[PDB]
Amino acid sequence: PRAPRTYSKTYSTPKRPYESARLDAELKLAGEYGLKNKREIYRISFQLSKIRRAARDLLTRDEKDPKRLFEGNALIRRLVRIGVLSEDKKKLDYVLALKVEDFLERRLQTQVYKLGLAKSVHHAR
Amino acid sequence: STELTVQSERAFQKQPHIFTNPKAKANRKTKRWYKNVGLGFKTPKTAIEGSYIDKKCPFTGLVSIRGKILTGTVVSTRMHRTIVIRRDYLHYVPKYNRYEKRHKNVPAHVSPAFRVQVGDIVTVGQCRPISKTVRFNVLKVASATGKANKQFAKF
Amino acid sequence: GISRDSRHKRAATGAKRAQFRKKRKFELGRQAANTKIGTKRIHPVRTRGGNQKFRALRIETGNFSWASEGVARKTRITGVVYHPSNNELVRTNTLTKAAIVQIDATPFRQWYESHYGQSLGKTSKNTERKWAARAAEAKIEHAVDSQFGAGRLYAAISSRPGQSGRCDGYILEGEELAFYLRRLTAKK
Amino acid sequence: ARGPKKHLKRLAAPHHWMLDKLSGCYAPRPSAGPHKLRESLPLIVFLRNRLKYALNGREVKAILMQRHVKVDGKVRTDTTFPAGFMDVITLEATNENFRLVYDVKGRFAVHRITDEEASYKLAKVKKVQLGKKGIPYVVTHDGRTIRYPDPNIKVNDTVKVDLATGTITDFIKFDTGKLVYVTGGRNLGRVGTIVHRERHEGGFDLVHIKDSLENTFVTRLNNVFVIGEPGRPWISLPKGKGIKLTISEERDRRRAQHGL
RNA sequence: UAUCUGGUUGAUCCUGCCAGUAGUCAUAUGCUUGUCUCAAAGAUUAAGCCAUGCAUGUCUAAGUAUAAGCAAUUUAUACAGUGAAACUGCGAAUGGCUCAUUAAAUCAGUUAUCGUUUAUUUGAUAGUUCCUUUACUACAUGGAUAUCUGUGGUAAUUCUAGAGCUAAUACAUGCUUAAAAUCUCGACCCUUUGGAAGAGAUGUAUUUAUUAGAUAAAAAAUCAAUGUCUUCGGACUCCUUGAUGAUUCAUAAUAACUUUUCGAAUCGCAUGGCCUUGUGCUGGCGAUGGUUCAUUCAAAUUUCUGCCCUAUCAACUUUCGAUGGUAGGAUAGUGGCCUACCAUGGUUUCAACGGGUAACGGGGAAUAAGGGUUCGAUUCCGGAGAGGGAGCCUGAGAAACGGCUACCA
RNA sequence: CGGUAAUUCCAGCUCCAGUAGCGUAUAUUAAAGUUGUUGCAGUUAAAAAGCUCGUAGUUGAACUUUGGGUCUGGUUGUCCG
RNA sequence: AGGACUUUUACUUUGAAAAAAUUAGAGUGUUCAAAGCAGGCGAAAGCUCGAAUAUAUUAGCAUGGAAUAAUGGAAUAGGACG
RNA sequence: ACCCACUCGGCACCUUACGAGAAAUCAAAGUCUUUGGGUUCUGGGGGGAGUAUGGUCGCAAGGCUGAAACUUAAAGGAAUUG
RNA sequence: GCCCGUCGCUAGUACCGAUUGAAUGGCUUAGUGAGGCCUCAGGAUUUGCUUAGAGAAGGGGGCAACUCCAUCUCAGAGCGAAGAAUCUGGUCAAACUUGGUCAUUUAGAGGAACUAAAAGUCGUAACAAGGUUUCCGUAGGUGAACCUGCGGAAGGAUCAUUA
Ligand SMILES: [Mg+2]
Ligand SMILES: [Mg+2]
Ligand SMILES: [Mg+2]
Ligand SMILES: [Mg+2]
Ligand SMILES: [Mg+2]
Ligand SMILES: [Mg+2]
Ligand SMILES: [Mg+2]
Ligand SMILES: [Mg+2]
Ligand SMILES: [Mg+2]
Ligand SMILES: [Mg+2]
Ligand SMILES: [Mg+2]
Ligand SMILES: [Mg+2]
Ligand SMILES: [Mg+2]
Ligand SMILES: [Mg+2]
Ligand SMILES: [Mg+2]
Ligand SMILES: [Mg+2]
Ligand SMILES: [Mg+2]
Ligand SMILES: [Mg+2]
Ligand SMILES: [Mg+2]
Ligand SMILES: [Mg+2]
Ligand SMILES: [Mg+2]
Ligand SMILES: [Mg+2]
Ligand SMILES: [Mg+2]
Ligand SMILES: [Mg+2]
Ligand SMILES: [Mg+2]
Ligand SMILES: [Mg+2]
Ligand SMILES: [Mg+2]
Ligand SMILES: [Mg+2]
Ligand SMILES: [Mg+2]
Ligand SMILES: [Mg+2]
Ligand SMILES: [Mg+2]
Ligand SMILES: [Mg+2]
Ligand SMILES: [Mg+2]
Ligand SMILES: [Mg+2]
Ligand SMILES: [Mg+2]
Ligand SMILES: [Mg+2]
Ligand SMILES: [Mg+2]
Ligand SMILES: [Mg+2]
Ligand SMILES: [Mg+2]
Ligand SMILES: [Mg+2]
Ligand SMILES: [Mg+2]
Ligand SMILES: [Mg+2]
Ligand SMILES: [Mg+2]
Ligand SMILES: [Mg+2]
Ligand SMILES: [Mg+2]
């Protein structure tokens, strides 16, 4: 009897596993950024879904409400610190507008590729 | 439901450790001990000058009132020195957002100082376990009749 | 092994409760003392948390108090004449609380004689002046004088010989005594 | 269980000892003492965790054994001694003196407090009774039984034990408009002034408290500890004085007072 | 984390289910399997049975040392060092495991104990043990007893009988030791306002009677009794009383009671000061005890409300306690908890009672537009149990089972 | 699907899905507006008791001070200091 | 701070309470993450901010409101005041 | 007794969709995804089956209550063309 | 075209079921009742107070009441105190025997079925006016579907006779 530490899942497979357009989009995103599996896209989509759930929950709350202010600006500052949300749109309504490709872009893979010290995405990997 | 004799049973009925001195010539009725249960509850005059004994009287007996205070309606006054009170309430089923009429039967011990009958709403108070099932002592008969205060009609 | 838990009793409704747990030690009940008269024999019992209890079976003499003038004296219990719970204890001379017994009554008698000196049943100047100050206020009622002439006092025990081990009580006196004579005259 | 329980599993320890949920199956169960274990603080927690003077159990044992800890002027060489609220912990090494007062987050904060005032202690009167031979006595929250108190000292009141002789030096009478501390519930560590004390015939008194920031709350009377007169506390209040800044105000404090 | 698709027809629109789909701290299983971190894990059927080995013993400067054990050297004529064994003390009732029993039962939230026990920890806490004190051990009272020395028994077990010494914070006894005041009983006098030599008891503990434990507010007269002073008219002016919401409470007082509890015949270190310069008088810091009252760890009960399916379970309970009354017994304490005598009562269509649960309750888990559905044997809190049953010693705490007694298997 | 040209069986080739994981079985949740309080249907698809009375349950007509005037405190958007 | 009478509810706002772990969620480069409750900064000469919050929808307690829903007054006046 | 006009109540009827339905059709089967006036009973694919069993009513006939094991990918409703 | 039942064959499922079955468990009448606890007794042994008379040889520190002594030592006898076996009555009550009862499993001769398997047999009831319109309730009959009688109903093959 020792206090457990909580493992938790970090992805969620889609319910329709066999969508042609979605499969093609997933392969596009895998080839663009050299993702090993399609579990990577699922993980980014899960992170984005958690972010959107928090954003929508805070949006439902009334404007100028301590909960709204505190955690909304906390999430805003966290996302701009990550870099996915541009400084222009720190409004918590453009948070709902982020796409999975945005978080894909901030990976150390793509950043090493952008800096140019790696000349290919797979070379960066 | 109260015997005319102030003691009717085999054992003598006295309030324990309150003694009236017969060698003295005051010759009052007796030395009757009493107390007020507090909470702004008026001790009944029928208890203040009564001649019953009722070991479990909140006003004259050893029992003390403390804890819950429950208001209910008398449903059975026809078992000796004791009352059966119907407490009604509404249980909130949340799966339907709907309430549900429910009732519980609380036994209690009404002192002879009170005159109760089927239908009187009663304020009752918690005390020690008096019997297997009674744990409350009747403290006030709010509605003596309710709708029987005026009975006849003579213009 | 005698339990006093509420589990074995039926519910207020009347359902037969199933056995929830085997009876504990903090629910035990011990054998009745059912004390007797003669040859003092008190047995200690070690109860919960130490706290010696004293079973007072076979008890002959004990303290008894007189409330009117309020004086207590050691005196002998001589039989039991009434018990408000079970007359079987009276027939078996079992002495428990609230039982009604007879008293040798001598110690009260010469205490009265050395205290008022009224010669029931029919010196230094200090004592004489004390008696004069008393001014015959000892007008104690007639029935106690009747049993004083009889010689045996009517006392009701108040101590619990089963628990305490003592045999203390008080004389019936005032309307008290009256009531019990009625009951005794019912027996008579 | 048949008899007393002598083990305190780590998760079951109070969230104010605020230990590590890992790195141990059990937690120090405070031995019987002057304070409730839920409200107290074991010496091992105060030294190993709060002060970091030690490293583990053996080090705390060695510290306590050599008689450097002095709880309220007494040695208290047992590892799990329940050093509770307002007790004084003296270490002649480092000549340091601590008084246990909750920080407004509601925790036993480390309060380095001066030697001169470390001579005395404050206490709440929990009972005033008449013991044998008609001798009046007063029971404080520590369980200290002070004999022959001032005749008009009443319950819920506060007293200033000299902590050397262990007798009564001065006392403060409970009434409205008086500086006060809170010792339970959501309002842990909060300090304010008594605005009103609603009686509630039948039990469970309540008092309303207004702090310096002009915020108002209400707390149970068992939960209340008068600490002095407004503007003149009888002890040295910890850093922050228990104003309970809002989470956004705490964030503004982090942002504003910031130097690296 | 608000989505649907294939199948009845020659073809269509439906109702409908089957199937598909994605989960699952839901397991099992198949095929594969390189790394780091992390981790469940004989719960489901069998709370079925168990070989074997461990799972609880404990010594500080400070209870007991004559091991004929070790050290015998710088500390050693009683003893000091270290230290087996054993007596003493304390824990062994914590912890760990399982979910069999249990459906107002457990449990959760919320109350109560002015209804009780509580080792320990912490804070306080007692002159009286004298009993006629003008004859006593208080510079220290007695006897056993283990360990050990030796003789055995049994095939064997933590089996121990006989003999011989020996100790205690073990078992027994028992001493001081003041004063004061209050109660009671009188060798006398001198005519009242009567007032006084003097003698015994009173700590606490237990038991029982009685009393005090007050209190809304200004004056009177009066007879009856009789107290102080009287500057002999008469004035009586002064009366003390804590807490809660409430008490017969806290506490105090009187009378008594007890096969008479406690009130230190105990250990370590340092051994100072006074000179009444002697082993004399005092004297510090602790360690164990020790009565009571608190506090803490608690423990028992306890109020309101909340439980899954079932009527192919509608009346259930009481001679054997069912509901209540009274008194007693027992209880640590309230309580039909048990007894004696009375009353005939209590629950129920708002589902009582009965039956089922492959039901331990809960905090929680999965699932997720919102509402919900299912699960919760298991890391925390409670409860119960040690093969099934009962019974009990020791203690503060057990109906204990790595404690005993008996029956059944 | 398989009855002599099998896009479905056994293989080879190519490809697809997840990928150190994937496949099966039972159970369960969303899908299930196929449990429907939010939120189901009853003419014919399953389903209005043959009809009426009736205790409990559920539900139950309207009506008992609405206006105004002033002062005054915070919070806003005001115009600008 | 005291005697005095209190129609009683249902309802709803606020607060005290609903153990920790878990869920939510703030801070924090465990190399990221699952996690964890850590850590950060000095010149390196001890100085430090933390260990946030919310929710639990039932029962109980306090509190403000009086629409909605229910009960009760005075019909024999035995009614209310002086 | 008719005639004209009006009204209340009843068995009904014609037209129509501007509403509802899968439609046949309905002036209620409308006022239902813009979902809540009160309330009772019933159904959850077909078959087994309104069968067995257990109650209960009946003289009997039979009535009321009333499953499962198992099997099955449909059974069924309205309408269109043959 | 579609389809209905009887009889015939095969596998499975379920039911009834005489056998007055069998096991287990639950209670339970009646009769026994271990062991603990309490109590009535009892009294091996261990002891203390006593003068209870001896040898002991100053068995006091003065031939003698040792100028007795915690003196050697048993008949003493009493008074205690502890006190084992045993034992009286209860009390908690496990469990045993005996039947009774219920519940679950459990066989079981035989009987009545229902499914699936559709290339068996006898008819052809129904779907069209199914060639007697259909169906419902009830009763009778018969190889079988079904037929008939009496009331209904259209889900009818008529929404229609002021011809
Ligand atoms: Mg345990
Ligand atoms: Mg949905
Ligand atoms: Mg069809
Ligand atoms: Mg087809
Ligand atoms: Mg499916
Ligand atoms: Mg490596
Ligand atoms: Mg198992
Ligand atoms: Mg030991
Ligand atoms: Mg040593
Ligand atoms: Mg049940
Ligand atoms: Mg009194
Ligand atoms: Mg008292
Ligand atoms: Mg009683
Ligand atoms: Mg469960
Ligand atoms: Mg079970
Ligand atoms: Mg569980
Ligand atoms: Mg299980
Ligand atoms: Mg547990
Ligand atoms: Mg147990
Ligand atoms: Mg086993
Ligand atoms: Mg012990
Ligand atoms: Mg046991
Ligand atoms: Mg074991
Ligand atoms: Mg154990
Ligand atoms: Mg044993
Ligand atoms: Mg081919
Ligand atoms: Mg449907
Ligand atoms: Mg049809
Ligand atoms: Mg139909
Ligand atoms: Mg109908
Ligand atoms: Mg009705
Ligand atoms: Mg209305
Ligand atoms: Mg929590
Ligand atoms: Mg998290
Ligand atoms: Mg069906
Ligand atoms: Mg059918
Ligand atoms: Mg039948
Ligand atoms: Mg058709
Ligand atoms: Mg067959
Ligand atoms: Mg016997
Ligand atoms: Mg033919
Ligand atoms: Mg035909
Ligand atoms: Mg035909
Ligand atoms: Mg024809
Ligand atoms: Mg024909």
Side-chain angles (χ1 to χ4, degrees), chain C residues 137-154:
Chain C
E137 71 76 20
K139 208 48 69 198
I140 88 166
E141 71 86 29
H142 154 278
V144 303
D145 322 322
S146 317
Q147 50 259 18
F148 259 134
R152 300 271 185 75
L153 265 202
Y154 271 143

PDB file of all heavy atoms in Angstrom, chain C residues 137-154:
ATOM      1  N   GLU C 137     -39.273  19.838  70.781  1.00  0.00           N
ATOM      2  CA  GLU C 137     -39.582  19.944  69.362  1.00  0.00           C
ATOM      3  C   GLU C 137     -39.602  18.581  68.684  1.00  0.00           C
ATOM      4  O   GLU C 137     -40.123  18.462  67.570  1.00  0.00           O
ATOM      5  CB  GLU C 137     -38.586  20.907  68.698  1.00  0.00           C
ATOM      6  CG  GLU C 137     -37.144  20.407  68.541  1.00  0.00           C
ATOM      7  CD  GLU C 137     -36.958  19.410  67.414  1.00  0.00           C
ATOM      8  OE1 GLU C 137     -37.819  19.368  66.514  1.00  0.00           O
ATOM      9  OE2 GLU C 137     -35.953  18.670  67.428  1.00  0.00           O
ATOM     10  N   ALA C 138     -39.072  17.550  69.340  1.00  0.00           N
ATOM     11  CA  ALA C 138     -39.064  16.193  68.798  1.00  0.00           C
ATOM     12  C   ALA C 138     -40.481  15.631  68.879  1.00  0.00           C
ATOM     13  O   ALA C 138     -40.820  14.811  69.736  1.00  0.00           O
ATOM     14  CB  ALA C 138     -38.069  15.317  69.548  1.00  0.00           C
ATOM     15  N   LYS C 139     -41.325  16.090  67.958  1.00  0.00           N
ATOM     16  CA  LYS C 139     -42.712  15.645  67.848  1.00  0.00           C
ATOM     17  C   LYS C 139     -42.885  14.664  66.698  1.00  0.00           C
ATOM     18  O   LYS C 139     -43.870  14.717  65.955  1.00  0.00           O
ATOM     19  CB  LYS C 139     -43.645  16.842  67.688  1.00  0.00           C
ATOM     20  CG  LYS C 139     -45.057  16.607  68.211  1.00  0.00           C
ATOM     21  CD  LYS C 139     -45.046  15.995  69.605  1.00  0.00           C
ATOM     22  CE  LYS C 139     -44.530  16.978  70.646  1.00  0.00           C
ATOM     23  NZ  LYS C 139     -44.114  16.287  71.897  1.00  0.00           N
ATOM     24  N   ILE C 140     -41.902  13.776  66.528  1.00  0.00           N
ATOM     25  CA  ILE C 140     -41.927  12.798  65.450  1.00  0.00           C
ATOM     26  C   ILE C 140     -43.229  11.994  65.467  1.00  0.00           C
ATOM     27  O   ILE C 140     -43.840  11.767  66.520  1.00  0.00           O
ATOM     28  CB  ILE C 140     -40.685  11.896  65.558  1.00  0.00           C
ATOM     29  CG1 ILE C 140     -40.946  10.692  66.461  1.00  0.00           C
ATOM     30  CG2 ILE C 140     -39.497  12.694  66.073  1.00  0.00           C
ATOM     31  CD1 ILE C 140     -39.893   9.617  66.343  1.00  0.00           C
ATOM     32  N   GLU C 141     -43.664  11.581  64.278  1.00  0.00           N
ATOM     33  CA  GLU C 141     -45.015  11.078  64.088  1.00  0.00           C
ATOM     34  C   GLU C 141     -45.214   9.735  64.794  1.00  0.00           C
ATOM     35  O   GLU C 141     -44.275   9.107  65.285  1.00  0.00           O
ATOM     36  CB  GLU C 141     -45.335  10.981  62.594  1.00  0.00           C
ATOM     37  CG  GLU C 141     -44.613   9.877  61.842  1.00  0.00           C
ATOM     38  CD  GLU C 141     -45.330   8.545  61.918  1.00  0.00           C
ATOM     39  OE1 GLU C 141     -46.574   8.539  62.041  1.00  0.00           O
ATOM     40  OE2 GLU C 141     -44.648   7.505  61.862  1.00  0.00           O
ATOM     41  N   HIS C 142     -46.475   9.297  64.825  1.00  0.00           N
ATOM     42  CA  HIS C 142     -46.894   8.226  65.724  1.00  0.00           C
ATOM     43  C   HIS C 142     -46.483   6.837  65.244  1.00  0.00           C
ATOM     44  O   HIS C 142     -46.137   5.987  66.071  1.00  0.00           O
ATOM     45  CB  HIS C 142     -48.410   8.298  65.924  1.00  0.00           C
ATOM     46  CG  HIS C 142     -49.047   6.989  66.277  1.00  0.00           C
ATOM     47  ND1 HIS C 142     -49.379   6.041  65.332  1.00  0.00           N
ATOM     48  CD2 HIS C 142     -49.420   6.475  67.472  1.00  0.00           C
ATOM     49  CE1 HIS C 142     -49.927   4.998  65.930  1.00  0.00           C
ATOM     50  NE2 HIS C 142     -49.963   5.235  67.230  1.00  0.00           N
ATOM     51  N   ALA C 143     -46.528   6.576  63.935  1.00  0.00           N
ATOM     52  CA  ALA C 143     -46.286   5.219  63.449  1.00  0.00           C
ATOM     53  C   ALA C 143     -44.854   4.768  63.715  1.00  0.00           C
ATOM     54  O   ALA C 143     -44.621   3.607  64.078  1.00  0.00           O
ATOM     55  CB  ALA C 143     -46.613   5.125  61.959  1.00  0.00           C
ATOM     56  N   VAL C 144     -43.879   5.660  63.528  1.00  0.00           N
ATOM     57  CA  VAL C 144     -42.498   5.290  63.825  1.00  0.00           C
ATOM     58  C   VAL C 144     -42.340   4.978  65.306  1.00  0.00           C
ATOM     59  O   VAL C 144     -41.588   4.073  65.682  1.00  0.00           O
ATOM     60  CB  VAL C 144     -41.520   6.381  63.347  1.00  0.00           C
ATOM     61  CG1 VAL C 144     -41.691   6.631  61.862  1.00  0.00           C
ATOM     62  CG2 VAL C 144     -41.743   7.667  64.102  1.00  0.00           C
ATOM     63  N   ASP C 145     -43.066   5.692  66.171  1.00  0.00           N
ATOM     64  CA  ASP C 145     -43.088   5.310  67.578  1.00  0.00           C
ATOM     65  C   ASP C 145     -43.737   3.947  67.771  1.00  0.00           C
ATOM     66  O   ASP C 145     -43.341   3.192  68.666  1.00  0.00           O
ATOM     67  CB  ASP C 145     -43.820   6.361  68.413  1.00  0.00           C
ATOM     68  CG  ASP C 145     -43.546   7.770  67.944  1.00  0.00           C
ATOM     69  OD1 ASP C 145     -42.396   8.051  67.552  1.00  0.00           O
ATOM     70  OD2 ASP C 145     -44.478   8.600  67.981  1.00  0.00           O
ATOM     71  N   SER C 146     -44.734   3.618  66.949  1.00  0.00           N
ATOM     72  CA  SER C 146     -45.384   2.317  67.063  1.00  0.00           C
ATOM     73  C   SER C 146     -44.400   1.189  66.780  1.00  0.00           C
ATOM     74  O   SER C 146     -44.296   0.229  67.553  1.00  0.00           O
ATOM     75  CB  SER C 146     -46.581   2.243  66.116  1.00  0.00           C
ATOM     76  OG  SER C 146     -47.334   3.441  66.161  1.00  0.00           O
ATOM     77  N   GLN C 147     -43.655   1.292  65.679  1.00  0.00           N
ATOM     78  CA  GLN C 147     -42.649   0.257  65.443  1.00  0.00           C
ATOM     79  C   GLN C 147     -41.437   0.372  66.362  1.00  0.00           C
ATOM     80  O   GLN C 147     -40.729  -0.625  66.544  1.00  0.00           O
ATOM     81  CB  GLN C 147     -42.166   0.203  63.985  1.00  0.00           C
ATOM     82  CG  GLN C 147     -41.738   1.497  63.347  1.00  0.00           C
ATOM     83  CD  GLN C 147     -42.806   2.055  62.441  1.00  0.00           C
ATOM     84  OE1 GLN C 147     -43.972   1.673  62.531  1.00  0.00           O
ATOM     85  NE2 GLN C 147     -42.414   2.955  61.550  1.00  0.00           N
ATOM     86  N   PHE C 148     -41.174   1.544  66.945  1.00  0.00           N
ATOM     87  CA  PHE C 148     -40.148   1.635  67.977  1.00  0.00           C
ATOM     88  C   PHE C 148     -40.545   0.824  69.203  1.00  0.00           C
ATOM     89  O   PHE C 148     -39.721   0.119  69.793  1.00  0.00           O
ATOM     90  CB  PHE C 148     -39.910   3.098  68.345  1.00  0.00           C
ATOM     91  CG  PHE C 148     -38.683   3.682  67.717  1.00  0.00           C
ATOM     92  CD1 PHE C 148     -38.722   4.926  67.116  1.00  0.00           C
ATOM     93  CD2 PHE C 148     -37.492   2.979  67.714  1.00  0.00           C
ATOM     94  CE1 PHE C 148     -37.594   5.465  66.536  1.00  0.00           C
ATOM     95  CE2 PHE C 148     -36.359   3.512  67.135  1.00  0.00           C
ATOM     96  CZ  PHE C 148     -36.411   4.757  66.544  1.00  0.00           C
ATOM     97  N   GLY C 149     -41.814   0.923  69.601  1.00  0.00           N
ATOM     98  CA  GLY C 149     -42.328   0.030  70.624  1.00  0.00           C
ATOM     99  C   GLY C 149     -42.274  -1.421  70.188  1.00  0.00           C
ATOM    100  O   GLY C 149     -41.973  -2.311  70.988  1.00  0.00           O
ATOM    101  N   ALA C 150     -42.568  -1.679  68.912  1.00  0.00           N
ATOM    102  CA  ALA C 150     -42.372  -3.016  68.364  1.00  0.00           C
ATOM    103  C   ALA C 150     -40.896  -3.393  68.367  1.00  0.00           C
ATOM    104  O   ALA C 150     -40.540  -4.546  68.635  1.00  0.00           O
ATOM    105  CB  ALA C 150     -42.948  -3.098  66.953  1.00  0.00           C
ATOM    106  N   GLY C 151     -40.023  -2.431  68.072  1.00  0.00           N
ATOM    107  CA  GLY C 151     -38.592  -2.635  68.115  1.00  0.00           C
ATOM    108  C   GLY C 151     -37.920  -2.796  66.769  1.00  0.00           C
ATOM    109  O   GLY C 151     -36.690  -2.695  66.699  1.00  0.00           O
ATOM    110  N   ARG C 152     -38.677  -3.036  65.702  1.00  0.00           N
ATOM    111  CA  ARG C 152     -38.118  -3.218  64.369  1.00  0.00           C
ATOM    112  C   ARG C 152     -38.578  -2.072  63.482  1.00  0.00           C
ATOM    113  O   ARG C 152     -39.781  -1.827  63.353  1.00  0.00           O
ATOM    114  CB  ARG C 152     -38.540  -4.560  63.773  1.00  0.00           C
ATOM    115  CG  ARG C 152     -38.096  -5.760  64.585  1.00  0.00           C
ATOM    116  CD  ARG C 152     -36.717  -6.228  64.154  1.00  0.00           C
ATOM    117  NE  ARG C 152     -36.316  -7.451  64.840  1.00  0.00           N
ATOM    118  CZ  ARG C 152     -36.788  -8.658  64.561  1.00  0.00           C
ATOM    119  NH1 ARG C 152     -37.680  -8.848  63.601  1.00  0.00           N
ATOM    120  NH2 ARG C 152     -36.352  -9.701  65.260  1.00  0.00           N
ATOM    121  N   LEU C 153     -37.624  -1.380  62.869  1.00  0.00           N
ATOM    122  CA  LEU C 153     -37.932  -0.248  62.009  1.00  0.00           C
ATOM    123  C   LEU C 153     -38.178  -0.718  60.581  1.00  0.00           C
ATOM    124  O   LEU C 153     -37.662  -1.750  60.153  1.00  0.00           O
ATOM    125  CB  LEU C 153     -36.793   0.771  62.033  1.00  0.00           C
ATOM    126  CG  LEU C 153     -36.927   1.941  63.009  1.00  0.00           C
ATOM    127  CD1 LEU C 153     -36.066   3.103  62.564  1.00  0.00           C
ATOM    128  CD2 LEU C 153     -38.369   2.377  63.136  1.00  0.00           C
ATOM    129  N   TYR C 154     -38.976   0.048  59.846  1.00  0.00           N
ATOM    130  CA  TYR C 154     -39.244  -0.241  58.444  1.00  0.00           C
ATOM    131  C   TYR C 154     -38.364   0.648  57.577  1.00  0.00           C
ATOM    132  O   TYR C 154     -38.577   1.864  57.516  1.00  0.00           O
ATOM    133  CB  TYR C 154     -40.719  -0.019  58.119  1.00  0.00           C
ATOM    134  CG  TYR C 154     -41.584  -1.233  58.345  1.00  0.00           C
ATOM    135  CD1 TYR C 154     -42.874  -1.107  58.837  1.00  0.00           C
ATOM    136  CD2 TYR C 154     -41.112  -2.506  58.065  1.00  0.00           C
ATOM    137  CE1 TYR C 154     -43.670  -2.214  59.046  1.00  0.00           C
ATOM    138  CE2 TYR C 154     -41.900  -3.619  58.269  1.00  0.00           C
ATOM    139  CZ  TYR C 154     -43.178  -3.468  58.760  1.00  0.00           C
ATOM    140  OH  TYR C 154     -43.967  -4.573  58.967  1.00  0.00           O
TER     141      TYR C 154
END
